[PDB]
Amino acid sequence: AVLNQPSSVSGSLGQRVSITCSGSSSNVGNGYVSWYQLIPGSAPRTLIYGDTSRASGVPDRFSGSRSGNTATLTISSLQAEDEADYFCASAEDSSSNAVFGSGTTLTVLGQPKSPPSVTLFPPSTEELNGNKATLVCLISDFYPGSVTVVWKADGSTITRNVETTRASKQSNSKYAASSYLSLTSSDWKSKGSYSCEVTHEGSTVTKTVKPSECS
Amino acid sequence: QVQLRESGPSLVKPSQTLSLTCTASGLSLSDKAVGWVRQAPGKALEWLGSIDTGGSAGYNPGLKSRVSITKDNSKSQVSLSVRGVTTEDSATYYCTTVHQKTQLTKSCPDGYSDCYGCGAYCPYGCSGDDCYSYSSYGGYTYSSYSSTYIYEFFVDAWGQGLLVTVSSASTTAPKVYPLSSCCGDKSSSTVTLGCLVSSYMPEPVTVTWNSGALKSGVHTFPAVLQSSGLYSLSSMVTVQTFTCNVAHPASSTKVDKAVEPKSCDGS
């Protein structure tokens, strides 16, 4: 029912990687296998059909092959934008009964480190009219994709009512995230300054807003 | 060329019937069936079925009892129905064009080589048949092609997809608040503005700026989920008027919010 792929695979920038798709005589052994690329937040893209034929607009760096009940997708001269989930697919018994592979997440190693860009937004005058204040920390352009977020007011660390997203893939194959500090209107005005401190690969980037000077 | 677009409700109650529609158009539609593929949050791609030019529908055997696929050529639309849905049916649903064809394929029988690719070693009897074999026992034997069927399948084109959530919970439309930097912020020639899409459920929402006319310098962030069960996300612009267009399909709400930098005027 499933075509077995490795859950995850890694390769170096500028080198080659291979993803396998193993099945039985009914599917992969049938000799017509397709491959698809899925970049999160994007429509799937067909890469290969009929074992070795490349779909339109797919460069020769992508290559398909098959030996018995196991097909492999081979990507050469790996680039950052090749980071995606790759699925094999095949027909089984019928040409209108498709089986998909379990999927493989590809990581391209060896890309440069990138510090995060941080923007801290204060609560709006409209929101504070409802006695609530949402501080918004927007974090973009960091690789690798992992940051730790810390909120502070007047030097003290705040843990209450903090909610932070996981890092998500941007359009440029880098990562983005956000953190939200939820306060009452009185909490917002009662402190001299709030800070959003974003730590990435041991380095911290900080932005700060002052309520009394926010107008 | 192909254009595939999915439409239908983003939220469906358990045990009800999920109904979706795909509006297809383009010269590249011909020779192709229109199919439906879904992907649940942590799962792989799953095939649902398709309807071909001949007007017949084929289905995933595991879902045939619950799935129905029809077409309305007067509207150039193909429909999908899933009966008795559970939370297992929450997924992103893709409209596709599909290639499906059973092909008769000729190959040499076991142990025989092709008489066309023997170079200068071809036996003379190759003139009468397609394949040949040799054993030091009985010498050269000959044979015709064997015939097998090869079932071809591949998805050609994909739609953008539509997210459907199966749940019995109601919706909450978002509030849109403007985002602008503090007046006491250290300044630069770059202005950061944004829109806070706050406290909605369920997913998704979309954000554009100035009805799509403004795109460069626009960064929209995936949502956070609070303890209340409500989502919130923000979209920011870096650089006139600035209007963010927020759409929340599950509640049938569209919001236009004009955003200005802080005047820092006493006003």
Numbering used by the authors:
A (entry chain B): 2 to 9, 11 to 217
B (entry chain A): 27 to 265, 272 to 299
The authors write:
Consistent with the five structures solved previously, the 7 new CDRH3 structures also showed a long “stalk” formed by 2 anti-parallel β-strands supporting a compact, globular “knob”, further establishing the stalk-knob configuration as the general structural peculiarity for the ultralong bovine CDRH3s. Each of the knob structures starts with the conserved sequence motif [CP(D/E/A)G(Y/W)], in which the initial cysteine residue forms the first disulfide bond with another cysteine residue in the knob, and the motif forms a type I β turn.
The four antibodies with 6 cysteines (BOV-1, BOV-2, BOV-3, BOV-4) used three different cysteine pairing patterns; BOV-1 and BOV-2 used, while BOV-3 used and BOV-4 used pairing patterns. To examine the extent of this flexibility, we superimposed the heavy chain variable domains of each Fab molecule in the asymmetric unit for antibodies BOV-1 or BOV-4 in one asymmetric unit.
